[PDB]
Design a protein around this ligand. Structure first.
Ligand SMILES: CCCCC[C@H](CC(=O)NO)C(=O)N[C@H](C(=O)N1CCC[C@H]1CO)C(C)C
Ligand SMILES: [Zn+2]
Length: 147
């Protein structure tokens, strides 16, 4: 159930996503496919732009517990701390994983695939991935700082 995934180079991956004022059934389908894809990609997280949606919608798959199943809509960063660097690849890139620097822990606000905006604190792999999707969907990508 994978939608249309955009690959680097791609304007939409480098495109800034806009966080919608309200979760529409169209927006819900977008996330639903985003996970469906991301998983189909076996990715630990997929960002809206990646799946061809120029809207700040993020879906996570970081086993921060027993079963992976994180969804956030129009997430925004609230706080970041610590400096990390870990290799990863992007659904847009052909699995070319590189070590990208991001904060060690970060707390961000988002709404669930159900349509309820809440604030969640992310640390480690959670904080890294969630913050990464924020960047990716805002058209910013780790490659922007790789060299
Ligand atoms: C909720 C967001 C979670 C982080 C997403 C990352 C990188 C990405 O493409 N973000 O848009 C991802 O899962 N990377 C995967 C991958 O290359 N690796 C393998 C190890 C885990 C992950 C990052 O290194 C690919 C398959 C999508
Ligand atoms: Zn990515």
């Amino acid at each position: 159930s994978v939608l249309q995934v955009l690959h680097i180079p791609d304007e939409r991956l480098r495109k800034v996503a806009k966080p919608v004022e309200e979760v529409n059934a169209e927006i819900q389908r977008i996330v639903d496919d985003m996970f469906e894809t991301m998983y189909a990609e076996e990715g630990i997280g997929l960002a809206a732009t990646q799946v061809d949606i120029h809207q700040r919608i993020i879906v996570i798959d970081v086993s921060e517990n027993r079963d992976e199943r994180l969804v956030l809509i129009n997430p925004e960063l609230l706080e970041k701390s610590g400096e990390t660097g870990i290799e990863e690849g992007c659904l847009s890139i052909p699995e070319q994983r590189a070590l990208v620097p991001r904060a060690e822990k970060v707390k961000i606000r988002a709404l669930d695939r159900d349509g309820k905006p809440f604030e969640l604190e992310a640390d480690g792999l959670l904080a890294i991935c969630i913050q990464h999707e924020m960047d990716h969907l805002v058209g910013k990508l780790f490659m922007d700082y790789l060299s």
